[PDB]
Amino acid sequence: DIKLFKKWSYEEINIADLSLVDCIAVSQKACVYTPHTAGRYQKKRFRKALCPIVERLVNSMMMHGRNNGKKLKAIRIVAYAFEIIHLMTGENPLQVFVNAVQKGGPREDSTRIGSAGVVRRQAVDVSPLRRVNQAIYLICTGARNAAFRNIKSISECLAEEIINCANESSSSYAIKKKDEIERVAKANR
């Protein structure tokens, strides 16, 4: 009987990837009424994976210097975006957001490896934590760039970006950046 924002349940949501099941937290300790917890999540290496997923979303939502530390404004933005998401394509907005998180990060990448003095740009593999982090970062950047010098508000932009990310449509920032990363990765090895 604990709901997100007192409206949405996440008692029935599932992941259905099985690689990202351990890295996104909607369970015992992470079921909260509001995405404000003043925890200590960066003291150890992997403790970042127990911060509730919506709080990580709001943590990346306050960026570009103008907006540093303004946590409550970010929470209001995210809450109204979730209302807009539920209104159209009526579903649980947290389930839509989890689906979008599962799609917005590349599965493989490229880097410089010094095999025997001569080098390449060899393809490598991406870990689940890296994929989750990149999905969050790319969604937030897409929404932020959409709303700059624009008639549409920031929460409308964020709702559109999340919905488009969940549907694999190549009109979102995250999907296209990820496809380009994967294309170069398949090309360099």
């Binding site: 992997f46 599965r107 493989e108 095999s115 490598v124 593999d125 890296r130």
Partner: protein, 58 residues
Amino acid sequence: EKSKLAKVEKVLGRTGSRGGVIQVRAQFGRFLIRNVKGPVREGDILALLETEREARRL
């Protein structure tokens, strides 16, 4: 397009000139030595887009 899941069973070391690369041994049930970017643990799960490929020694 179609991922393949492999389980990390131990971590071997770090490569790259700046050390931003991790060497693992993963198991489907065959073993492979694969080469990863980002923080990893034993027990993590990888989504391999290629199946017939290994990494040189370190």
